Structure formats: structure tokens, C-alpha cells
């Protein structure tokens, strides 16, 4: 029953069998994979069925939220209040290491839009407002032709999949930012506003956009919904461990021989990921000094921690990090860890929206003191201060970017403390 020797995803187990664009990525190959089939029947079965199936599915927050999507998609499932309900696909993908949504938009967006309509049955929405990243210009047009064939065929729009459903799907290309990645700042970008996180409550669920309720979901979570309700959520629940239910499009990157976004069997030791599917990393296991586990926000872990940990939400949490978007970036002895997170935290300073004081001021302050840390211009107690202000901005921000900035530096402090001391110590004698 419990497949503890856990790994080796199958092509049928791969929700999207066209992630590389290998076969026909367009609508002509969509129905070949199994897409746009039996959607007429389920849409008639009522929202509770998909809610029931997703309960068995175990879909959790794949956009870094780490929350059961079944609860969230049913969170706002209330009778009509007159204000139309809406859907949003968080296709921002601004994290340095997030690529799977870029692949799914470019190659299999028919699963995405169908997931919107089969999802839109659950929240009882009248239209979707997917937020394609502006940098994904040709991927935006890629889903437009998916939009084109799906609309006139009756699959989406009026009589959604011929089920008496007026659910639609709109497209909004961005103009460049990470802060639009978070839903509470995404909606302002949708709502003709500069991307600034919105304070909750009010939640997006009861009121998302233009004073109207709107459900926000990660790109894969909505895109995997049609398959998990077609073949069966329990089969998809057979993947992942407890509260890790399912499989994840891992994003292999860094100093790895063959960097990849494979939809690969989930809750798996990173050793199996890097060697079996990524063709090893450069120099081998001994070469890699540390690994960014699942995203830039997620604190990186060294070989001393990642020697046995499986890439699952529960094990990642107790590993003082998170799986997030499975953005696994492997990093070796040759490169300096301080320089590695230097560019990350510099990027974070280049993406704070400045709305709340802790993120606007703290991240910039972090950038300056850390830039000294690259050379080593500090004293022993500055790491403790860098510890201190990290906790100060951890959770005190309006949005989760501030503590999203706390975690990477926090993990760097706790793990390679002697490295900071010696590099800082080297700073002193060379500049004596």
C-alpha cells in the first residue's frame, strides 16, 4: 500500500504528457492526451464532485503557499451574492528557478484553460482572468491559439463544454515584476494598478477583483485538476507522502550536468533527482556545496542536510526550508555561497514593491550589509545583527515576500556560519 520505495514517475502519471512540446502541443494533440474528454459529464455532475475528488486528490499549494487547494477552492464556495465570481491563474513565475509554468503555458495550455473551466465549476465563476507573465510573450500567444480553438468549439465560454455554464477565460500579460507573483499583489496588476499586495481580510475568495469574488491558483494546480478528476484523485494521491499528495514538476538547475524541468515523481530524495533524470551534477555529489531546495525564498541546504531528505512538504519543513516550487538549484564548492545569495538578495531588493516599511527598508539594508559580507567588511556580531533584522522583517510585512527574503539569508546564516567568519577574517588581514 505505502510505496515507500518512492519514485520513477510514469508518462501516464505525468499529468501533462507534452511538457517538452515533443508531440503536438496544440489543440490537435490536446485531445489525444486525454484532454477535452468527459468534461461534459463532470461539469454536469456539480461542483461538489470536483470538490469531493480534490479532497481525495490531496492537492496542496504548489505556488509556495503549501495549503490544500481542495480546502481553498471550496473556501469561497457559497451561494451567489449577485457579484460575479472569477478565476485567476498565477502565471507570473517570477521566482529565480521557476520554469514549469513557462513550459506548461508554451506547450500544454489547453490543460490549463480546461482546468479553469472544470475548476470554474467548483467556485461557480463566470470567467477566468489568468495572468500570463509579460516576459512570456510567445508563450502568451501560445495559449492564445489554445484560447482560440477552445472558445469557438464550445469547450470554454458560453455553455462551457456544453454544460450550460457561462464560464469564460481572459488573458492579461504582465509588464514585469516578481511582486505580481503573489496573489494579493497580482490582483492590483489585474485591477489596473501598480502591483502592491492587498491586506487580507478581505481575502481574494470573498472579493478578488473589481469588488468581486475571485479564486487564485497556481498554474499547475488548476492545470492538473482535469486529470485528477478524470482518471482519479486517489491515483494522484498515491503519489506524494502524507500531506504531500501528488507529483510535482521539479525544476532542476544550478551546476547540474543536465538542468531540467521534468514532471518527475514527487517526495523523492534529491540524489535520485540529480543523477537519474538530470544526468548527474558537475563533479558529482562531493562537488555540490549546497542546494537551493525548491525556490529562491526557500533557504538553501548543504550536503550535510540534504544527504537523505526527500523533496516533500513535510520533510522540507522539518529541514528548515520548503519545497515551494521544487526549484532545485545545485551549487558546488567552487562558487561562493555568499556570492550566490548576493545575486538573489540583490534581485529581491530589485523586486520589493516598497509598500510596507519592513520590506522597503529591511531588504535594502540587507543588500548593503551583505555586499560587505561578500568582501567580509564586518565584525563577528554583524551576523547576529543580520540574524536580528531578518527576524524583524520575518512576518511583519504585509505580504510573504518580506519573510520570503528572510528565509534564504536565514538559512545561509544558520548553516555556513564558519564560512562567513573565515571570509570576514580573510577580509581583515588582506586589508590590514
Ligand X SMILES: Cc1cc2nc3c(=O)[nH]c(=O)nc-3n(C[C@H](O)[C@H](O)[C@H](O)COP(=O)(O)O)c2cc1C
The CB-of-179 to ligand SF4 minimum distance in angstroms stands at 5
Count CA within 13 A, CB hemisphere, residue 281.
24
Torsion angle in degrees (nearest 10) through CA of 280, 282, 283, 289: -100
CA–CA gap between residue 65 and residue 239 (Å, rounded):
19
Q: Which three cell numbers stand for residue 105?
A: 503555458
Sheet holding 86-91, edge to edge: 169-171, 127-132, 86-91, 214-218
CA–CA gap between residue 407 and residue 319 (Å, rounded):
12
Residue 162 interface partner, choices ligand X, another protein, ligand SF4, none, CB cut-off 5-8 Å depending on type: none
The CB-of-295 to ligand X minimum distance in angstroms stands at 9
Interface stretch with another protein, choices 114-122, 240-248, 346-354, 421-429 (CB under 8 A) = 346-354
Do strands 214-218 and 260-264 pair parallel, antiparallel, or not at all (unpaired)? unpaired
Interface stretch with ligand X, choices 148-156, 176-184, 336-344, 423-431 (CB under 6 A) = 176-184
Do 190 and 134 touch, CB atoms closer than 8 A? no
Nearer to ligand X, 33 or 72 (CB): 72
> Residue 138, annotated ligand binder?
no
Of positions 46, 48, 137, 428, contacts another protein by CB under 8 A = 137
| Collapsed DSSP state (helix, strand, coil) of residue 261 | strand
Interface stretch with another protein, choices 35-43, 58-66, 109-117, 304-312 (CB under 8 A) = 35-43
Q: Does 221 bind ligand X (CB under 6 A)?
A: yes
CA–CA gap between residue 394 and residue 400 (Å, rounded):
9
Discontinuities after residues in the chain (C–N over 2.5 A): none
> Residue 216, annotated ligand binder?
yes
Name which of residues 63 to 82 contact ligand X (CB under 6 A): 63-65, 67, 69, 72
Q: Does 395 bind another protein (CB under 8 A)?
A: yes
Q: Does 217 bind ligand X (CB under 6 A)?
A: yes
Name which of residues 154 to 183 contact ligand SF4 (CB under 6 A): 179
Sign, CA dihedral 331-333-335-336, equals positive
Hey, which bits of 338-387 come out as E strands?
none
Size of the site for another protein (CB under 8 A): 153
Q: Does 354 bind ligand SF4 (CB under 6 A)?
A: yes
The CB-of-304 to another protein minimum distance in angstroms stands at 20
The CB-of-350 to ligand SF4 minimum distance in angstroms stands at 11
- The secondary element (H helix, E strand) that includes residue 52 is helix 47-57
Q: Which three cell numbers stand for residue 253?
A: 538547475
271 contact partners, CB below 8 Å, separation of at least 6: 285
Give the residue closest to ligand X by C-beta: 181
Question: Measured at the alpha carbon of residue 219, what is the angle toward residues 34 and 143, in degrees to the nearest 5?
Answer: 65
Q: Which three cell numbers stand for residue 409?
A: 539569508
Q: Nearest to residue 157, comparing CAs of 217, 117, 112?
A: 117
Q: Does 306 bind another protein (CB under 8 A)?
A: no
Q: Nearest to residue 415, comparing CAs of 255, 290, 286, 323?
A: 290
> Residue 33, annotated ligand binder?
no
Q: Nearest to residue 324, comparing CAs of 93, 145, 149, 103?
A: 93
Interface stretch with ligand X, choices 88-96, 117-125, 231-239, 314-322 (CB under 6 A) = 88-96
Q: Does 359 bind ligand SF4 (CB under 6 A)?
A: yes
Residue 265 interface partner, choices ligand X, ligand SF4, another protein, none, CB cut-off 5-8 Å depending on type: none
> Residue 397, annotated ligand binder?
yes
Residue 198 interface partner, choices ligand SF4, ligand X, another protein, none, CB cut-off 5-8 Å depending on type: another protein
Of positions 353, 370, 383, 412, contacts ligand SF4 by CB under 6 A = 353
Partners of 301 in the β-ladder: 291
Name which of residues 393 to 412 contact ligand SF4 (CB under 6 A): 397-399, 401-402
| Collapsed DSSP state (helix, strand, coil) of residue 184 | helix
> Residue 82, annotated ligand binder?
no
Tell me the binding residues for [4Fe-4S] cluster. 352-356, 359-360, 397, 399, 402
- Which residues would be at the binding site for ligand SF4 (CB under 6 A)? 179, 197, 352-356, 359-360, 397-399, 401-402
Tell me the binding residues for NADH. 63-64, 67, 72, 93-95, 183, 325
- Which residues would be at the binding site for ligand X (CB under 6 A)? 61-65, 67, 69, 72, 90, 92-95, 98, 178, 181-183, 216-219, 221, 399-401, 404
Amino acid at each position: 500500500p505505502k510505496k515507500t520505495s518512492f519514485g520513477s514517475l510514469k508518462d501516464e502519471d505525468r499529468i501533462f504528457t507534452n511538457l517538452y512540446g515533443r508531440h503536438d502541443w496544440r489543440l490537435k494533440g490536446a485531445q489525444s492526451r486525454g484532454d477535452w474528454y468527459k468534461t461534459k459529464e463532470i461539469l454536469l455532475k456539480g461542483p461538489d464532485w470536483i470538490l469531493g475528488e480534490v479532497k481525495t486528490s490531496g492537492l496542496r499549494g504548489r505556488g509556495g503557499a503549501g495549503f490544500p487547494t481542495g480546502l481553498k477552492w471550496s473556501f469561497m464556495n457559497k451561494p451567489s451574492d449577485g457579484r460575479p465570481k472569477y478565476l485567476v491563474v498565477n502565471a507570473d513565475e517570477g521566482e529565480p528557478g521557476t520554469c514549469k509554468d513557462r513550459e506548461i503555458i508554451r506547450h500544454d495550455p489547453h490543460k490549463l484553460v480546461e482546468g479553469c473551466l472544470v475548476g470554474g465549476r467548483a467556485m461557480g465563476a463566470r470567467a477566468a482572468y489568468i495572468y500570463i507573465r509579460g516576459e512570456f510573450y510567445n508563450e502568451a500567444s501560445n495559449l492564445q491559439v489554445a484560447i482560440r480553438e477552445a472558445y469557438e468549439a464550445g469547450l470554454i465560454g458560453k455553455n462551457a463544454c456544453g454544460s450550460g455554464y457561462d464560464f469564460d477565460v481572459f488573458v492579461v500579460r504582465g509588464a514585469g515584476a516578481y511582486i505580481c507573483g503573489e496573489e494579493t499583489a497580482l490582483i492590483e496588476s489585474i485591477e489596473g494598478k501598480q502591483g502592491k499586495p492587498r491586506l487580507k481580510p478581505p481575502f481574494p475568495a470573498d472579493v478578488g477583483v473589481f469588488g468581486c469574488p475571485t479564486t487564485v491558483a497556481n498554474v499547475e494546480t488548476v492545470a492538473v485538476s482535469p486529470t485528477i478528476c478524470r482518471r482519479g484523485g486517489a491515483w494522484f494521491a498515491s503519489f506524494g507522502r502524507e500531506r504531500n499528495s501528488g507529483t510535482k514538476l521539479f525544476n532542476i538547475s544550478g551546476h547540474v550536468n543536465h538542468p531540467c524541468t521534468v514532471e518527475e515523481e514527487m517526495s523523492v530524495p534529491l540524489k535520485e533527482l540529480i543523477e537519474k533524470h538530470a544526468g548527474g551534477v558537475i563533479g558529482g555529489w562531493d562537488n555540490l556545496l549546497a542546494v537551493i531546495p525548491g525556490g529562491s525564498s526557500t533557504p538553501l541546504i548543504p550536503k550535510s542536510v540534504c544527504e537523505t531528505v526527500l523533496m516533500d512538504f513535510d520533510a522540507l519543513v522539518q529541514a528548515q526550508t520548503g519545497l515551494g516550487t521544487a526549484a532545485v538549484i545545485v551549487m558546488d564548492r567552487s562558487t561562493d555561497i555568499v556570492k550566490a545569495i548576493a545575486r538573489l538578495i540583490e534581485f529581491y531588493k530589485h523586486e520589493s514593491c516598497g509598500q510596507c516599511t519592513p520590506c522597503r527598508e529591511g531588504v535594502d539594508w540587507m543588500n548593503k550589509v551583505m555586499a560587505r559580507f561578500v568582501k567580509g567588511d564586518a565584525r563577528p556580531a554583524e551576523i547576529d545583527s543580520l540574524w536580528e533584522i531578518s527576524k524583524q522583517i520575518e512576518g511583519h510585512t504585509i505580504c510573504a515576500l518580506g519573510d520570503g527574503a528572510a528565509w534564504p539569508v536565514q538559512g545561509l546564516i544558520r548553516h555556513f556560519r564558519p564560512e562567513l567568519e573565515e571570509r570576514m577574517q580573510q577580509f581583515a588581514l588582506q586589508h590590514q
